[PDB]
Enzyme design. Structure first.
Site, PDB file in Angstrom:
ATOM      1  N   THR C   1      39.048  48.719  40.762  1.00 22.17           N
ATOM      2  CA  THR C   1      39.650  49.235  42.032  1.00 22.17           C
ATOM      3  C   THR C   1      38.655  49.950  42.937  1.00 22.17           C
ATOM      4  O   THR C   1      37.608  50.396  42.495  1.00 22.17           O
ATOM      5  CB  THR C   1      40.852  50.149  41.660  1.00 22.17           C
ATOM      6  N   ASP C  17      42.135  48.421  47.862  1.00 20.85           N
ATOM      7  CA  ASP C  17      41.704  47.024  47.768  1.00 20.85           C
ATOM      8  C   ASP C  17      42.749  46.204  46.993  1.00 20.85           C
ATOM      9  O   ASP C  17      43.732  46.757  46.489  1.00 20.85           O
ATOM     10  CB  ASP C  17      40.330  46.924  47.091  1.00 20.85           C
ATOM     11  N   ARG C  19      41.965  43.735  44.387  1.00 15.98           N
ATOM     12  CA  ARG C  19      41.380  43.055  43.231  1.00 15.98           C
ATOM     13  C   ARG C  19      41.826  43.677  41.909  1.00 15.98           C
ATOM     14  O   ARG C  19      41.794  44.893  41.751  1.00 15.98           O
ATOM     15  CB  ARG C  19      39.850  43.051  43.327  1.00 15.98           C
ATOM     16  N   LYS C  33      48.397  47.752  45.267  1.00 18.84           N
ATOM     17  CA  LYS C  33      48.016  49.009  44.618  1.00 18.84           C
ATOM     18  C   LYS C  33      48.613  50.243  45.294  1.00 18.84           C
ATOM     19  O   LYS C  33      48.638  51.319  44.700  1.00 18.84           O
ATOM     20  CB  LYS C  33      46.494  49.136  44.533  1.00 18.84           C
ATOM     21  N   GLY C  47      42.769  52.484  37.648  1.00 21.54           N
ATOM     22  CA  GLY C  47      42.679  52.594  36.196  1.00 21.54           C
ATOM     23  C   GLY C  47      43.349  51.430  35.497  1.00 21.54           C
ATOM     24  O   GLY C  47      43.212  50.278  35.919  1.00 21.54           O
ATOM     25  N   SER C 129      36.750  52.768  40.528  1.00 23.71           N
ATOM     26  CA  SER C 129      35.366  52.379  40.235  1.00 23.71           C
ATOM     27  C   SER C 129      34.476  52.368  41.477  1.00 23.71           C
ATOM     28  O   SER C 129      33.265  52.564  41.377  1.00 23.71           O
ATOM     29  CB  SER C 129      35.318  51.007  39.557  1.00 23.71           C
ATOM     30  N   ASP C 166      30.898  47.706  45.054  1.00 30.36           N
ATOM     31  CA  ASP C 166      31.398  47.797  43.687  1.00 30.36           C
ATOM     32  C   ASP C 166      31.961  46.455  43.214  1.00 30.36           C
ATOM     33  O   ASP C 166      32.759  45.819  43.917  1.00 30.36           O
ATOM     34  CB  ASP C 166      32.446  48.908  43.572  1.00 30.36           C
ATOM     35  N   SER C 169      35.803  45.991  42.547  1.00 30.17           N
ATOM     36  CA  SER C 169      36.688  45.864  43.706  1.00 30.17           C
ATOM     37  C   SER C 169      36.296  44.732  44.661  1.00 30.17           C
ATOM     38  O   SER C 169      35.121  44.333  44.741  1.00 30.17           O
ATOM     39  CB  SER C 169      36.806  47.196  44.454  1.00 30.17           C
TER      40      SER C 169
HETATM   41  C1  LIG Z   1      39.918  48.208  39.638  1.00 26.70           C
HETATM   42  C2  LIG Z   1      40.134  46.674  39.833  1.00 26.70           C
HETATM   43  C3  LIG Z   1      39.096  48.392  38.320  1.00 26.70           C
HETATM   44  O1  LIG Z   1      38.070  47.385  38.172  1.00 26.70           O
HETATM   45  C4  LIG Z   1      41.297  48.997  39.568  1.00 26.70           C
HETATM   46  O2  LIG Z   1      41.099  50.229  38.847  1.00 26.70           O
HETATM   47  C5  LIG Z   1      42.514  48.287  38.873  1.00 26.70           C
HETATM   48  C6  LIG Z   1      43.831  49.117  39.022  1.00 26.70           C
HETATM   49  C7  LIG Z   1      45.088  48.333  39.421  1.00 26.70           C
HETATM   50  C8  LIG Z   1      45.029  46.913  39.585  1.00 26.70           C
HETATM   51  C9  LIG Z   1      46.198  46.180  39.779  1.00 26.70           C
HETATM   52  C10 LIG Z   1      47.435  46.844  39.859  1.00 26.70           C
HETATM   53  C11 LIG Z   1      47.488  48.256  39.764  1.00 26.70           C
HETATM   54  C12 LIG Z   1      46.307  48.991  39.574  1.00 26.70           C
HETATM   55  N1  LIG Z   1      42.241  48.141  37.442  1.00 26.70           N
HETATM   56  C13 LIG Z   1      42.259  46.949  36.791  1.00 26.70           C
HETATM   57  O3  LIG Z   1      42.354  45.863  37.355  1.00 26.70           O
HETATM   58  C14 LIG Z   1      42.193  46.984  35.280  1.00 26.70           C
HETATM   59  C15 LIG Z   1      40.734  47.212  34.752  1.00 26.70           C
HETATM   60  C16 LIG Z   1      40.754  47.901  33.401  1.00 26.70           C
HETATM   61  C17 LIG Z   1      40.646  47.164  32.216  1.00 26.70           C
HETATM   62  C18 LIG Z   1      40.761  47.809  30.977  1.00 26.70           C
HETATM   63  C19 LIG Z   1      40.929  49.231  30.918  1.00 26.70           C
HETATM   64  O4  LIG Z   1      40.888  49.839  29.751  1.00 26.70           O
HETATM   65  C20 LIG Z   1      42.066  50.517  29.268  1.00 26.70           C
HETATM   66  C21 LIG Z   1      41.075  49.956  32.085  1.00 26.70           C
HETATM   67  C22 LIG Z   1      40.944  49.309  33.336  1.00 26.70           C
HETATM   68  N2  LIG Z   1      42.704  45.714  34.767  1.00 26.70           N
HETATM   69  C23 LIG Z   1      43.754  45.596  33.909  1.00 26.70           C
HETATM   70  O5  LIG Z   1      44.531  46.502  33.625  1.00 26.70           O
HETATM   71  C24 LIG Z   1      43.913  44.235  33.259  1.00 26.70           C
HETATM   72  C25 LIG Z   1      44.859  43.332  34.095  1.00 26.70           C
HETATM   73  N3  LIG Z   1      44.368  44.355  31.865  1.00 26.70           N
HETATM   74  C26 LIG Z   1      43.499  44.328  30.817  1.00 26.70           C
HETATM   75  O6  LIG Z   1      42.278  44.281  30.932  1.00 26.70           O
HETATM   76  C27 LIG Z   1      44.072  44.442  29.425  1.00 26.70           C
HETATM   77  N4  LIG Z   1      43.881  45.813  28.887  1.00 26.70           N
HETATM   78  C28 LIG Z   1      45.001  46.735  29.208  1.00 26.70           C
HETATM   79  C29 LIG Z   1      44.633  48.172  28.758  1.00 26.70           C
HETATM   80  O7  LIG Z   1      44.275  48.190  27.359  1.00 26.70           O
HETATM   81  C30 LIG Z   1      43.174  47.314  27.035  1.00 26.70           C
HETATM   82  C31 LIG Z   1      43.502  45.853  27.448  1.00 26.70           C
END
Ligand SMILES: *[C@@](C)(CO)[C@](*)(O)[C@H](Cc1ccccc1)NC(=O)[C@H](Cc1ccc(OC)cc1)NC(=O)[C@H](C)NC(=O)CN1CCOCC1
Lengths: 233, 239, 220, 244, 248, 243, 238, 231
Positions: C1, C17, C19, C33, C47, C129, C166, C169
């Site tokens: 994010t 954003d 993504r 988001k 997160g 991020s 980043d 994002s």
């Molecule tokens: C940006 C994209 C981070 O790169 C944002 O924080 C975003 C938040 C968001 C996105 C869509 C809708 C609402 C809010 N975060 C993510 O896209 C997030 C990245 C992430 C991966 C693992 C994490 O560790 C706990 C924390 C953050 N992506 C996800 O949640 C994806 C879809 N799911 C997984 O990777 C599966 N995970 C879930 C958590 O437990 C481990 C496996």
């Protein structure tokens, strides 16, 4: 209408006093304490010739050295007898010794007033036990007879009778019993008193006899050795 | 949470709730079972099934284990609970002890369950008597009965239900070694006892036999009607 | 994010954003988001994606239950308290970095709430991020009590900075403008990134795949 | 005020005229017990109780109807002594928890309120009965001075200059009004507390009695203590000589 | 406290449960509800008690509930108590499917609910469920089935049965016309309209006063179908010609 | 119907043949057991509370005898009825008010506090284990949005906003006095609102008070903090009444 | 009549009938005499025979090395209270390594016995106790009741016809504190003697003695051990 | 010190009746009259709000309450009891939304609420609610009107009236209501049904009315009620 833990104006508990009256309905049972051992006698009161007489057990063993005879509502005693059997084995497991006759009587007596409505456990008793017990066995103090009743009171007796015709049997025991009599005299005396108070004629399959003595363990009399003293009228 | 004493002692030393439950079994269907020397057979009368009713679903004889079966009298809803509790216990004895359940043991369980329901808070006694039948891994046949109080005894032959007094006294007269000689004759004793109460059975008689060799065999209205005729030429043999 | 929030003359402008990532791969190219809390309060999320969705829904649910009972417009502090205490209870195991913004009878309010349950009351906040890249824009260009269109421009430039600097994002910029008078949820506010037009023709012509088994089930 | 079926059998049951008789009967129990008196002076609080001697076989100081709740708080009970003793434990515990939580001695006004709330809880339900006792609480400090509170079976607490609870409580209050108390020292209050007890005590009704006294104030440095044998006897002489 | 306890789960001096028998009286006040087993299917026919002009009619039924892919039930008694039981029936049916991965057999679903109704009569101190249910369904063990349930927790399988208002008068009417092993769905439907005509105290019997549902085996799958007004009116007019056939 | 009874409908909180709850009705009569009357009047600038302060014997410390209670910095109340029940409802009110701020981060509205206590009081109306509280609560305070607020909750669970109300023995006669004075609209300044409250209590009891016979609690717009009027301030209003 | 079913029901006279009835159970059992000197505390208990073909009931029980009790009323309630008293003494010695002061044990009995007298569906303990103990404050005699009220007494007797003992103990009261152990027990028996019909008095079968003091721990004398105490008897001057 | 009774207070009479429910029905019958009408375009809910003293502040407490953005409520009977069900209905509506992310259908909400009302006729130591509910809602592009009474039974209505003169209310309704009346006309006939049983002359502070259409559920403002009162 009242609760189960209600005192009468006299001072006794209603449900407990009514439980004593339930013993008056049950079959009569005699026990005699002797220098040579302890004998336990009970009438079965078989209502039908089709009923298997051996399945009516009113004298059971708790350990090798302890026997017990009940009167009243037989079904109530089954939990009391099992709790007694568990306690003697728990005592053996922890202390590597046999439990004393008095201690086992005391353990059961503790369960007597464990009934109630409010402030009770998920698996608690609602009423006193409608059963009197005669514990007979041998320990360090020797051959001992103990009596118990629903009130929880337990006392050592030289000879005791409990059941329907317990009043007449006790006075018969006071007439016959003295300190020096033998076990053979004790069995003979208990059966005579038993045949007097019984509605049915005293028979080999009609009654139960058991003796605990310093010589050997708890022994319930078979048909043959019952007949051995039935032929002495 | 509901801790109310239901079964209590009366001024004269009686347990009314137990005695009332014993009145409920009195109103139930007549159930009788006799113990032979090779087979044990039990049967139920006082049926009055509406014909328009599925007779398979209202069976009062139930199997508990591969070697134990039972019949009952009184509240049919109460019995179904007891039967299910008895069936669970049969398998629980096999998970703990491995050895199959004995006829005396399963009776002792049913009796203790019924007794626990006369000395517990918030609970009401079971309104049924059960006739437990089976064979020990010993060879000896067994027949037991229970009642709402929780007392159990072994029987050579016994009847409980509607007009239990009548069948009880018929069995006392008719129970001899001559009546329990072979398989057919032990079955005849049950049916002859049922004809004392029922208005000419065959259609109104449900009965099942158990041998030490095979499991439970419930006889159909074709095999029962055979005994109606076999005893009829015994009854009409006075001339 | 990348998520950001700012306080201007009339109210609050929130940014995000679009993504979402699975490992190091783009899972969703167009993600929402900026979340509904109440008609007057909205909340950006960063997160753990699922933690962001469910936390923001539960509080949105609790506030609606609260406003129906009071019969009055919910306060941003109530949303803040409900979010703060919940996240703290879970000791940061619910990975929800949040930007909370709304307009009360008290006025305009902006919060940043951390997964562990710590809250910052500030004129401008960044989470995610790409938050540092977004903050560099806020520290360079922010001025107190900006006009509506000026603030819209500032936040969108902050999110862009995250998007382009980043790797976590990318894609579209979403805005949410909240005032005492008006609520504007501009979903596709900006489309800075676009897929290149296909040059080759990779049409899989009919009957190019071999079939072993076929079953056709008719329907109503 | 004496209606039949129910109404007075339960504490969870209002009567047609809006009364909880089970609470009123618990008050009847305290009215049947012997008198307990307490006076707030310029520099402390003094308690007095006519302990009735039921049998000559009991020792002196047996059945203490005077209690130490905290090192600075005293308790004078009237009514059913078993319930009074258990209420002392609650009072002690609430006073104990305060110190453990906050550090300083529990204020009497706060202590009274907390115990009175506990008494009140036993007036709302069919599952429990109201306490059959009234009790007084006395304390003194340099900051707050002399304070005296009384709590009845209903759960009501009030501040008192002078208070009486028991058999002849109304007869005793007419004797307390004769005292100045506000401009009196507690050294001369013990003197007065003694005689009011001797006046109110019915000699032909209740045969034998013993006088119990306790005090807390400037003289006792803030601690609730028993009135010494020397001081008690001097006050009892004043009680018997003013009987002329 | 024990003064306010009406002792719901207690035996009578004569050895019967008062609260169960009193609950059974409540069933006799409710709408007439019958079931008939046929060779090619099984149906339920129920009297509609919600018969006001101002009622909306939103649900597919008033008294008939679908429980399973292969099973359905009808209700007589307190309608709210029925909602508790019918919802529990659906849960039991789903529990079985979750574990065994096949539909619950009819008898097994009936017993499971009856175990619950029995419980409320023996312990707890609560009042029994004032509902009698009729169950229709198909399984791979016994085929088409019809079951009845009591407030006592007592159940029974029937070829033809009725519960509710004029239960006794209806069951003797079924005892006359029913042919074992010979009843087809057409003949069972005709019987259903006849029995309801006599037991209905307003003997005009429009389609809006009754409710009929059928359970058929159709090309490998079970089909539960509630007949709509035009279908029901057509069934009544067929019966009405039999009243005109007596003029011979 | 009307006057009919079947079962324990007069002993526990269950329906009478009319659909009434006698046990709740008795609790209203239990309010009169205190022997006191409270009056609450709302102005355009303030909210006023007045109650009878009965000190029969001088042995009682008059400072401890009160029915005015502080719940919040901005919310005060008057209790009418059984004194033990009243204090219980006050401690609960204080707990509900404090927990509201903790969970939601702002001070509880008078509106919302009254609703909360009414909801709690409703439970005793439905559960047979306990009797309803034989008391009545009237809350005052100034809301940030709608200004002066006066609210009153029952043992029954009814609650409502008021221009003016009374509770207690002289409840029904006082409400008649308030009706006449609200009918003829004045400028409801702090001066008249306090006086109206005192005159209503004065005329309905026909006593004419000394400053120690009544207790007054006020909440002003410029001073939202709940205040208990000293004898000096009460006497000042009482000498202003002498016209 | 309608107020005598539950401990929670207050009588219109300000009494609780259920507590008063439980107190009657104490007057049902046979008399026991408790008395103390300056160094010793003695319990003399008369035993009941249900039928003199059976043994005389156990009336004196051990609690700790320095504390003993004599019961009057329901035996099962007596043993229940006894186990509670034992436990509290055991906890005291486990935690503090010193004996629990007698007064403090009795105060704990007062707490435990109060609870059921205020709860619905519960009943009071149907037993009164006389407690003999020795600690830092010397010998002690305490009386307990079904009502959680207790007494710190010079001497006391409770039970069937215990009225006669109360009269004797009151007249020879001034002699007690300066009295020696040998005669202190004699005074106990001569009190227990008054609680008997003029036919027969104290024997080796029906008398139980419990003595504790500075010299010795709590010891129960019953049969052959009780016969030295009876010797030096003085016949009834009725 | 507290626990709770575990036995039912509602039991079957020898005649086979649940007496407490029928007595709770007496309570609703004695309550203030309220009416509901489905317009096949919207839903209208109108209730009598007789204030009795003028000292009472009308706007302080409401009889017509919203459960959520698209569902609304009225009652006849006991105010305090109604308020408990209001909170329970709102909480149930949120439970559904949290799982499905979709506004709860009226029928589903009514079923869930009725289950709660059923519980209080069987659970330990409680009496039934002395309240009948009028639940209206718009979902699936369709208007809904439901009634939930003390027993726990629900009914779907085109138009109904409850409380005082419910008999006179219904007989007036079926005589005047037709399944075609638009929301504007539905409000008129809702007020008229109350006018049939009012006795006291209506003002905009004397009756409370709420409407529900595709725009959602809302309470009509005093000004709107005043303009409609120009009949
Ligand atoms: C940006 C994209 C981070 O790169 C944002 O924080 C975003 C938040 C968001 C996105 C869509 C809708 C609402 C809010 N975060 C993510 O896209 C997030 C990245 C992430 C991966 C693992 C994490 O560790 C706990 C924390 C953050 N992506 C996800 O949640 C994806 C879809 N799911 C997984 O990777 C599966 N995970 C879930 C958590 O437990 C481990 C496996």
């Amino acid at each position: 209408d009242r609760g189960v833990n209600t005192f009468s104006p006299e001072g006794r508990l209603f449900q407990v006093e009514y439980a004593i009256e339930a013993i008056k309905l049950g079959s009569t049972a005699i026990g005699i304490q002797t220098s040579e051992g302890v004998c336990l006698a009970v009438e079965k009161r078989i209502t039908s010739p089709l009923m298997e007489p051996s399945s009516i057990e009113k004298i059971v063993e708790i350990d090798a050295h302890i026997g017990c005879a009940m009167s009243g509502l037989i079904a109530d005693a089954k939990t009391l007898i099992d709790k007694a059997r568990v306690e003697t084995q728990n005592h053996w497991f922890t202390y590597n010794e046999t439990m004393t006759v008095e201690s086992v009587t005391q353990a059961v007596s503790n369960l007597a007033l464990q009934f109630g409505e409010e402030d009770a456990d998920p698996g608690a008793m609602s009423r006193p036990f409608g059963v009197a017990l005669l514990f007979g066995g041998v320990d360090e103090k020797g051959p001992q007879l103990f009596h118990m009743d629903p009130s929880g009171t337990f006392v050592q007796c030289d000879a005791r009778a409990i059941g329907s015709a317990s009043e007449g049997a006790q006075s018969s025991l006071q007439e016959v019993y003295h300190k020096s009599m033998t076990l053979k005299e004790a069995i003979k005396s208990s059966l005579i008193i038993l045949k007097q108070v019984m509605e049915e004629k005293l028979n080999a399959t009609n009654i139960e006899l058991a003796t605990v003595q310093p010589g050997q363990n708890f022994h319930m009399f078979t048909k043959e050795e019952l007949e051995e003293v039935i032929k002495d009228i | 949470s509901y801790d109310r004493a239901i079964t209590v002692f009366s001024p004269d030393g009686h347990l009314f709730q137990v005695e009332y439950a014993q009145e409920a079994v009195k109103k139930g269907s007549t159930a009788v079972g006799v113990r032979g020397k090779d087979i044990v057979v039990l049967g139920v009368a006082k049926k009055s099934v509406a014909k328009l009713q599925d007779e398979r679903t209202v069976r009062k004889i139930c199997a508990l284990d591969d070697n134990v079966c039972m019949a009952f009298a009184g509240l049919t809803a109460d019995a179904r609970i007891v039967i299910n509790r008895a069936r669970v216990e049969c398998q629980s004895h096999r998970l703990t002890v491995e050895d199959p359940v004995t006829v005396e043991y399963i009776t002792r369980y049913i009796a203790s369950l019924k007794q626990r329901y006369t000395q517990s808070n918030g609970r009401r006694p079971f309104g049924i008597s059960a006739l437990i039948v089976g064979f020990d891994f010993d060879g000896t046949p067994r027949l037991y009965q229970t009642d709402p109080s929780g007392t159990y005894h072994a029987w050579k032959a016994n009847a409980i239900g509607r007009g239990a007094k009548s069948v009880r006294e018929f069995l006392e007269k008719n129970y001899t070694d001559d009546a329990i000689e072979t398989d057919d004759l032990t079955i005849k004793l049950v049916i002859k006892a049922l004809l004392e109460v029922v208005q000419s059975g065959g259609k109104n008689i449900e009965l099942a036999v158990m041998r030490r060799d095979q499991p439970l065999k419930i006889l159909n209205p074709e095999e029962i009607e055979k005994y109606v005729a076999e005893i009829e030429k015994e009854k009409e043999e006075n001339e | 994010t990348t998520i950001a929030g700012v306080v201007y003359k009339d109210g609050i402008v929130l940014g995000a954003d679009t993504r979402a990532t699975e490992g190091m791969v783009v899972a969703d190219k167009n993600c929402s988001k900026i979340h509904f809390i109440s008609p007057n309060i909205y909340c950006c999320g960063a997160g753990t994606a699922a933690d962001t969705d469910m936390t923001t829904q539960l509080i949105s649910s609790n506030l609606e239950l609260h406003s129906l009972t009071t019969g009055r417009l919910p306060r941003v502090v109530t949303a803040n308290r409900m979010l703060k205490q919940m996240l703290f209870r879970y000791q940061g195991y619910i990975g929800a970095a949040l930007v909370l913004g709304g307009v009360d009878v008290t006025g305009p309010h902006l919060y940043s709430i951390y997964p562990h349950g710590s809250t910052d009351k500030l004129p401008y906040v960044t989470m995610g991020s790409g938050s540092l890249a977004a903050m560099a824009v806020f520290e360079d260009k922010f001025r107190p009590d900006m006009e509506e269109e000026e603030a819209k421009k500032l936040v969108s430039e902050a999110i862009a900075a995250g998007i382009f600097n980043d790797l976590g994002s990318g894609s579209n910029i979403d805005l949410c403008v909240i005032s005492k008078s008006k609520l504007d949820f501009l979903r596709p506010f900006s489309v800075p990134n676009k897929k290149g037009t296909r040059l080759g023709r990779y049409r899989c012509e009919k009957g190019t795949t071999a079939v072993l088994t076929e079953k056709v089930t008719p329907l109503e | 005020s004496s209606i039949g079926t129910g109404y007075d059998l339960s504490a969870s049951t209002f009567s047609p005229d809006g009364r909880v008789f089970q609470v009123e009967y618990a008050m009847k129990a305290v009215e049947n017990s012997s008198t307990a008196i307490g006076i707030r002076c310029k520099d402390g609080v003094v308690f007095g109780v006519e302990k009735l001697v039921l049998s000559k076989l009991y020792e002196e100081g047996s059945n203490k109807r005077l209690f130490n709740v905290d090192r600075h708080v005293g308790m004078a009970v009237a009514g059913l002594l078993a319930d009074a003793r258990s209420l002392a434990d609650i009072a002690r515990e609430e006073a104990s928890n305060f110190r453990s939580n906050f550090g300083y001695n529990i204020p009497l006004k706060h202590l009274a309120d907390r115990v009175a709330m506990y008494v009140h809880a036993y007036t709302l339900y069919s599952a429990v009965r109201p306490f059959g006792c009234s009790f007084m609480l006395g304390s003194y400090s340099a900051n707050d001075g002399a304070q005296l509170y009384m709590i009845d079976p209903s759960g009501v607490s009030y501040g008192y200059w002078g208070c009486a609870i028991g058999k002849a409580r109304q007869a005793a209050k007419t004797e307390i009004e004769k005292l100045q108390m506000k401009e009196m020292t507690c050294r001369d209050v013990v003197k007065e507390v003694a005689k009011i007890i001797y006046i109110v005590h019915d000699e032909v009704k209740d045969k034998a009695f013993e006088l119990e006294l306790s005090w807390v104030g400037e003289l006792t440095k803030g601690r609730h203590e028993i009135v010494p044998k020397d001081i008690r006897e001097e006050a009892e002489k004043y009680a018997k000589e003013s009987l002329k | 406290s024990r003064r306010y306890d009406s002792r719901t789960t207690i035996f009578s001096p004569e050895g019967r449960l008062y609260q169960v028998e009193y609950a059974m009286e409540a069933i006799g006040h409710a709408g007439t509800c019958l079931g008939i087993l046929a060779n090619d299917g099984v149906l339920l026919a129920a009297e509609r008690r919600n018969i006001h002009k101002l009622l909306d009619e939103v649900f597919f039924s008033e008294k008939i509930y679908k429980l399973n892919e292969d099973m359905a039930c009808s209700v007589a008694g307190i309608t709210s108590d029925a909602n508790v039981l019918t919802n529990e029936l659906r849960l039991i049916a789903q529990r079985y499917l979750l574990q065994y991965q096949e539909p619950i057999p009819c008898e097994q679903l009936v017993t499971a609910l009856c175990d619950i109704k029995q419980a409320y009569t023996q312990f707890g101190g609560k009042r029994p469920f004032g509902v009698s249910l009729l169950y229709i369904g198909w399984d791979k063990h016994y085929g088409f089935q019809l079951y009845q349930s009591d407030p006592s927790g007592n159940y029974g399988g029937w070829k033809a049965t009725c519960i509710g208002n004029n239960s006794a008068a209806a069951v003797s009417m079924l005892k006359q016309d029913y042919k074992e092993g010979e009843m087809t769905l057409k003949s069972a439907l005709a019987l259903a309209v006849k029995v309801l005509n006599k037991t209905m105290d307003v003997s005009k019997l429009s389609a809006e006063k009754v409710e009929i549902a059928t359970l058929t085996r159709e090309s490998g799958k079970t089909v539960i179908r509630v007949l709509k007004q035009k279908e029901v009116e057509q069934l009544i007019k067929k019966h009405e010609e039999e009243e005109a056939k007596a003029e011979r | 119907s009307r006057g009919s009874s079947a079962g324990f409908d007069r002993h526990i909180t269950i329906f009478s043949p009319e659909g009434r709850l006698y046990q709740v009705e008795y609790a209203f009569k239990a309010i009169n057991q205190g022997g006191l009357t409270s009056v609450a009047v709302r102005g355009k600038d303030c909210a006023v509370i007045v109650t009878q302060k009965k000190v029969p014997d001088k042995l009682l410390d008059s400072s401890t005898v009160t029915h005015l209670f502080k719940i919040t910095e901005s919310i005060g109340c008057v209790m009418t009825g059984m004194t033990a029940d009243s204090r219980s409802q006050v401690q609960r009110a204080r707990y509900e008010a404090a927990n509201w701020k903790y969970k939601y981060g702002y001070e509880i509205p008078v509106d919302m506090l009254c609703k909360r206590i009414a909801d709690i009081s409703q439970v005793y109306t439905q559960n047979a284990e306990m009797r309803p509280l034989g008391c009545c609560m009237i809350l005052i305070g100034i809301d940030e949005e709608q200004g002066p607020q006066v609210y009153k909750c029952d043992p029954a669970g009814y609650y409502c906003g008021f221009k003016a109300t009374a509770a207690g023995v002289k409840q029904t006669e006082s409400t008649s006095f308030l009706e006449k004075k609200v009918k003829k609209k004045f400028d409801w300044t702090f001066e008249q609102t306090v006086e109206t409250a005192i005159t209503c209590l004065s005329t309905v009891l026909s006593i004419d008070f000394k400053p120690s016979e009544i207790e007054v609690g006020v909440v002003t717009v410029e001073n939202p903090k709940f205040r208990i009027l000293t004898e000096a301030e009460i006497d000042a209003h009482l000498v202003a009444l002498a016209e | 009549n309608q107020y005598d079913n539950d401990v929670t029901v207050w009588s219109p006279q300000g009494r609780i009938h259920q507590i008063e009835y439980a107190m009657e159970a104490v007057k049902q059992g046979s008399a026991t005499v408790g008395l103390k000197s300056k160094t010793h505390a003695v319990l003399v208990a008369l035993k009941r025979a249900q039928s003199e073909l059976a043994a005389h009931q156990k009336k004196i029980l051990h609690v700790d090395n320095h504390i003993g009790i004599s019961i009057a009323g329901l035996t099962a309630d007596a043993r229940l209270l006894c186990n509670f008293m034992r436990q509290e003494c055991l906890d005291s010695r486990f935690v503090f390594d010193r004996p629990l002061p007698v007064s403090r044990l009795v105060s704990l009995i007062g707490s435990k016995t109060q609870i059921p007298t205020q709860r619905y569906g519960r009943r009071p303990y149907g037993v009164g106790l006389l407690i003999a103990g020795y600690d830092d404050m010397g010998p002690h005699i305490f009386q307990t009741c079904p009502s959680a009220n207790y007494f710190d007494c010079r001497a006391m007797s409770i039970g069937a016809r215990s009225q006669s003992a109360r009269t004797y103990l009151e007249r020879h009261m001034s002699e007690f504190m300066e009295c020696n152990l040998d005669e202190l027990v004699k005074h106990g028996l001569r009190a227990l003697r008054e609680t008997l019909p003029a036919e027969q008095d104290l024997t080796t079968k029906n008398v139980s003695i419990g003595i504790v003091g500075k010299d010795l721990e709590f010891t129960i004398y019953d049969d052959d051990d009780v016969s030295p105490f009876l010797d030096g008897l003085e016949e009834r001057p009725q | 010190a507290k626990r709770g009774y575990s036995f039912s207070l509602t039991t079957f009479s020898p005649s086979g009746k649940l007496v407490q429910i029928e007595y709770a029905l007496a309570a609703v019958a004695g309550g203030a009259p309220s009416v509901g009408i489905k317009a096949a375009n919207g839903v209208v809910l109108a209730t009598e709000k007789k204030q009795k003293s003028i000292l009472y502040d009308e706007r302080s407490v409401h009889k017509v309450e919203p459960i959520t953005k698209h569902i609304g409520l009225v009652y006849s009977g006991m105010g305090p009891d109604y308020r408990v069900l209001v909170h329970r209905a709102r909480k149930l509506a949120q439970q559904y939304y949290l799982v499905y992310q979709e506004p709860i259908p009226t029928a589903q909400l009514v079923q869930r609420v009725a289950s709660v009302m059923q519980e209080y006729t069987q659970s330990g130591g409680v009496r039934p609610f002395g309240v009948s509910l009028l639940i209206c809602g718009w979902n699936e592009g369709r208007p809904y009107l439901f009634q939930s009474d003390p027993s726990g039974a629900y009914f779907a209505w085109k138009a109904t009236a409850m409380g005082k003169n419910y008999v006179n209310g219904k007989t007036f309704l079926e005589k005047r209501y037709n399944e075609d009346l638009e929301l504007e006309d539905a409000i008129h006939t809702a007020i008229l049904t109350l006018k049939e049983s009012f006795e006291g002359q209506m003002t905009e502070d004397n009756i409370e009315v709420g409407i529900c259409n595709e725009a959602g559920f809302r309470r009509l403002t005093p000004t709107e009620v005043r303009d409609y009162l120009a009949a």
